[PDB]
């Protein structure tokens, strides 16, 4: 509630419930490498 | 020396733990080698 940022981006998609844990930097999985990839030097939040 | 890594040689570290799970190993290697070099330069200054 008390920060500022240059720009805000949001990503929305649909995934199976068992594969929700795949959304994190450095994770190995089909979704991670062929569907959605996150950088190691990343800062953000995950809501599902 | 090893400095608590799973392999002293850097090439092994990058080839087994990938980037996202080895940067701690490179971190420990770098800090240990740096500390050794710092001790060496301090001793060299004393002797000089």
UniProtKB/Swiss-Prot annotation, chain B:
This is Spike protein S2'. The gene is S. Subunit of the fusion protein that is processed upon entry into the host cell. Mediates fusion of the virion and cellular membranes by functioning as a class I viral fusion protein. Contains a viral fusion peptide that is unmasked after S2 cleavage. This cleavage can occur at the cell membrane by host TMPRSS2 or during endocytosis by host CSTL. In either case, this triggers an extensive and irreversible conformational change that leads to fusion of the viral envelope with the cellular cytoplasmic membrane, releasing viral genomic RNA into the host cell cytoplasm. The chain holds residues 968 to 1015 of 1273 of the full protein.
């Amino acid at each position: 509630n008390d920060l500022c940022f240059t720009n805000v981006y949001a990503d929305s998609f649909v995934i199976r419930g068992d594969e929700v844990r795949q959304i994190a930097p450095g994770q190995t999985g089909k979704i991670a490498d062929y569907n959605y990839k996150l950088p190691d030097d990343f800062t953000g939040c995950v809501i599902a | 020396s090893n400095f608590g890594a799973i392999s002293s040689v850097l090439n092994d570290i990058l080839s087994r733990l990938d980037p996202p799970e080895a940067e701690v190993q490179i971190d420990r290697l770098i800090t240990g080698r740096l500390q050794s070099l710092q001790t060496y330069v301090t001793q060299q200054l004393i002797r000089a």
